[PDB]
Design a binder for these strands. Structure first.
Ligand SMILES: Nc1ncnc2c1ncn2[C@@H]1O[C@H](COP(=O)(O)CP(=O)(O)OP(=O)(O)O)[C@@H](O)[C@H]1O
Ligand SMILES: [Mg+2]
Ligand SMILES: [Mg+2]
Length: 829
DNA sequence: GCCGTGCGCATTCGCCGTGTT
DNA sequence: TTTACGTTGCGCACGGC
RNA sequence: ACACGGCGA
């Protein structure tokens, strides 16, 4: 509907959608920009009125420029104090202790902190501040240094946890309590500190010229240029982080790596690929990938609308003292009552941090929903992350949590129909949790609950239960439409997005490109009686282990009892799950310990439902090994294919130098590959250019490299290998997601799409076809091309030799008949 | 240059907020 | 200016044989 | 670009 000519907004929108909607749209983009700067200012202020200006990006561009000059004046002073044949100022004494880096930084930093915080910025105050600042380091890195790794394990793992420059200076007193060898610390006295700062105050004036000294004991100020600059940099930053909101008209079609989504032509347009380096983005500048541009476009032309009935419930039910949906964050704290009582009521704090923060988005989402109710429809611009996965641009989108998705329904519905009705019951059965049983038992769930559904539909307020299902608001959303069908019949116009979501798309994709039948089997890639749940399969396997006590259970010096603790907890698919999908991505046994500990124990601990683990560790380490054993003997080809990708990344990331005269024969280099739909991916992680240096309290800061070397930035051979596997398949599903949107649209005429990476959705009337579209695409894709062989050919002849050829062979293909996916009921994606 | 003592890294990606009591 | 139990196996490095 | 909480996958 728009060709290369639409260059002047408003004129294009109005003579296309009416100037009434053209204005609203533009009004909105601009507001997004407005709310952005607003959100910025509010912060740039809370930091200003909190001595943390040095932390704001607005100062960084300056700090970087004055930091070197300082340390370049700090040293010169020293050597010069050495030329002096006599006594040395007390400054050289209480300043040679800490690194000449911390010194300067803590200087510039602190000097700005208390000279932008209050209005009593005097030499006595600032200096005293820098003094306590310089002393609050004074090379007492007793643990950070002196080869006392105890810091990089039991002293650092916490400081980075404790929030606030107040609790880090306080909680640090803890570590100090314990002897830790050595001991005692002569206080710089409240008279040497000032002097320590004095010299520091100087040198800064001697070099940076930043601060200035009035002539009204003497006040401290900032130069008209080094003050206007952080206020300039601010204004800059302020308008480059807009709180993007949905659109009141179809998004602007993408025709290039930039300018898509919103119509307002601003200085910072939207980019198609969420890249980090502008260089990375320009890499797409001329790549021909029509099918990619079409998925993104088609997908963003999906007209959505607020689900008023679902909004009605949500609006009031989320204020409720006691919400019937144990998922929503309460309005108030978690009391406080329930080593001292506090021992058990310690998590209360952090658990409320999750609540208040989870509460903020909840309210923002509700703000957007209500804000956009009444609009005949709304759209979401779309772009990708760099592996090619599709993301809605605005904070509020059909990809958000339960309530979010519940608050949204497709704008263009159609008479539901026989099949559409069927597919909806299925949807409802899914929203309810009844989704790991064959389709017939699901319809039975919906039908055998007819009355509960109507009830919740009549007085959602009065009749909860819908709020006792896994997907409460979505289920609710379904209850409504279901009731509508009852009151109106199969000609009922329904626009409820019916979600078709693959079962572990990760292993499915691996199983696909490898024809892995065992894996495919597990992840429903073949027609089957009951739905295969690979997580349940691993859950059942773990259980057999647990069930075994003596053969696997030992005495406590132990297992046995340990297993019993779990058997008591009742280990199910809930656990081990994350561990099952990340194995083929690189997650190891140590990874599981953390996962199971953080995903199952940690949450089950502070709640009461799980207080029989006696120390989570070991109890988690234990599970970690069963999950490994159980999963390792389940996911095979996948892993093999994973290690094959790691070798290519490892090899390419490597920097080969000649054995006899080591000049670099081949330079480190990114792994490159093209997704089936024509979408190019460039994975080239980089090791931080400016090495960073912490200071425990004041924070962290970088600094221009010492050794003149940083031409490119230095590729991170480690990340390149740990990401390659996950990034690759992700780019395989994203392409699969895009391939399906285009396929479903051109072959089936589908206009509405509810996309969520490996989740495909439409209105009931088109579900049948999306059910086929996805699958047909899965099949045609992995049958038309060998993604691993094509990947090889991509780096094979290209940068790869100079000895390099320890490249494991492409995995042997399985006996899986891809075409079967077409007959698989549980595959979905 | 064969196989030993050792510091580092635990899967990836996207993005919002407050930095406190 | 008063919340925070605690943990483990492959690998690339600077290296004396 | 490194840190805390959350949400998403
Ligand atoms: N933690 C993670 N690490 C890497 N990739 C992840 C990930 N979480 C999600 N992904 C990807 O995002 C997809 C969608 O995420 P999920 O829906 O959480 C998975 P699922 O495999 O359908 O499990 P389910 O049976 O528990 O719902 C996954 O299938 C996977 O490809
Ligand atoms: Mg899924
Ligand atoms: Mg999913």
């Amino acid at each position: 509907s728009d060709i290369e000519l639409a260059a002047i907004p408003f004129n294009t929108l109005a003579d296309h959608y009416g100037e009434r909607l053209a204005r609203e749209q533009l009004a909105l983009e601009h507001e997004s920009y407005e709310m952005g700067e607003a959100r910025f200012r509010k912060m740039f202020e809370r930091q200003l009125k909190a001595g943390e200006v040095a932390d704001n990006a607005a100062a960084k561009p300056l700090i970087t420029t004055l930091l070197p000059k300082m340390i370049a004046r700090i040293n010169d002073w020293f050597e010069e104090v050495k030329a002096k044949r006599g006594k040395r100022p007390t400054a050289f004494q209480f300043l040679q202790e800490i690194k000449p880096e911390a010194v300067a930084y803590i200087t510039i930093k602190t000097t700005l902190a208390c000279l932008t915080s209050a209005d009593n910025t005097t030499v006595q105050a600032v200096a005293s501040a820098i003094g306590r600042a310089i002393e609050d380091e004074a090379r007492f890195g007793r643990i950070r240094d002196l080869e006392a790794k105890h810091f990089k394990k039991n002293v650092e793992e916490q400081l980075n946890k404790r929030v606030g420059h107040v609790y880090k200076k306080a909680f640090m007193q803890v570590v100090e309590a314990d002897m830790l060898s050595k001991g005692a610390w002569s206080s710089w006295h409240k008279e040497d500190s000032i002097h320590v700062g004095v010299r520091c105050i100087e040198m800064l004036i001697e070099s940076t010229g930043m601060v200035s000294l009035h002539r009204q004991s003497e006040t401290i100020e900032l130069a008209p240029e080094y003050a206007e600059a952080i206020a300039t940099r601010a204004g800059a930053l302020a308008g480059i982080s807009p709180m993007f909101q949905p659109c009141v008209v179809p998004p602007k079609p993408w025709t290039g790596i930039t300018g898509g989504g919103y119509w307002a032509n601003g200085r910072r347009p939207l980019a198609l690929v969420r890249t980090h380096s502008k260089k990375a983005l320009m890499r797409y500048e001329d790549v021909y990938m029509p099918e990619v541009y079409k998925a993104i476009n088609i997908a963003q032309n999906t007209a959505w609308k607020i689900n008023k009935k679902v909004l009605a419930v949500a609006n009031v039910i989320t204020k409720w003292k006691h919400c019937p949906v144990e998922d929503i964050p309460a309005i108030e704290r978690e009391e406080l009552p329930m080593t001292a009582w506090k021992r058990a009521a310690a998590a209360v704090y952090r658990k409320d941090k999750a609540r208040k923060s989870r509460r903020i988005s909840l309210e923002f989402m509700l703000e957007q929903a209500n804000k956009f109710a009444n609009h005949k429809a709304i759209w979401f611009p779309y772009n990708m992350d760099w592996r090619g996965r599709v993301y809605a641009v605005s904070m509020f989108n059909p990809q958000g949590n339960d309530m979010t998705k519940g608050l949204l329904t497709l704008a263009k519905g159609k008479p539901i129909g026989k099949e559409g009705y069927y597919w909806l019951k299925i949807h409802g059965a899914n929203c309810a949790g009844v989704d790991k049983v064959p389709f017939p038992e699901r319809i039975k769930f919906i039908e055998e609950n007819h009355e509960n559904i109507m009830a919740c539909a009549k007085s959602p307020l009065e009749n909860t239960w819908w709020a006792e299902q896994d997907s409460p608001f979505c289920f609710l959303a379904f209850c409504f439409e279901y009731a509508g069908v009852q009151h109106h019949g199969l000609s009922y116009n329904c626009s409820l997005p019916l979600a078709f979501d693959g079962s572990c798309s990760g292993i499915q994709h691996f199983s696909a490109m490898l024809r892995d039948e065992v894996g495919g089997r597990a992840v429903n890639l073949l027609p089957s009686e009951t739905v295969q749940d690979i997580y349940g399969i691993v859950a059942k396997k773990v259980n057999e282990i647990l069930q075994a006590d003596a053969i696997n259970g030992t005495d406590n010096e132990g297992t046995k009892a340990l297993a019993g603790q779990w058997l008591a907890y009742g280990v199910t698919r809930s656990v081990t799950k994350r561990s099952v999908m990340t194995l083929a991505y690189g997650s190891k046994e140590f990874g599981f310990r953390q996962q199971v500990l953080e995903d199952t124990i940690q949450p089950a601990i502070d709640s009461g439902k799980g207080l029989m683990f006696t120390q989570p560790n070991q109890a988690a380490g234990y599970m970690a090994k069963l999950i490994w054993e159980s999963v390792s003997v389940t996911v095979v080809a996948a892993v093999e294919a994973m290690n094959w990708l790691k070798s290519a990344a490892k090899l390419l990331a490597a920097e080969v130098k000649d054995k006899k005269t080591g000049e670099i024969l081949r330079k480190r280099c990114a792994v490159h590959w093209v997704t089936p739909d024509g979408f190019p991916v460039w994975q080239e992680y980089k090791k931080p250019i400016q090495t960073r240096l912490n200071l425990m309290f004041l924070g962290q800061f970088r600094l221009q490299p010492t050794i003149n070397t940083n031409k490119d930035s230095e590729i991170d051979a480690h990340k390149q290998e740990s990401g390659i596997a996950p990034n690759f398949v992700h780019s395989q599903d994203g392409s699969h997601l895009r391939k399906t949107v285009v396929w479903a649209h051109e072959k089936y005429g589908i206009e509405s799409f509810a996309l969520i990476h490996d989740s495909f959705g439409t209105i009931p009337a088109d579900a049948a076809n999306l059910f086929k579209a996805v699958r047909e695409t899965m099949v045609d894709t992995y049958e038309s091309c060998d993604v691993l062989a094509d990947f090889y050919d991509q780096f094979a002849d290209q940068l790869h030799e100079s000895q390099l050829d320890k490249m494991p062979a492409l995995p042997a293909k399985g006996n899986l008949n891809l075409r079967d996916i077409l007959e698989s009921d549980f595959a979905f994606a």
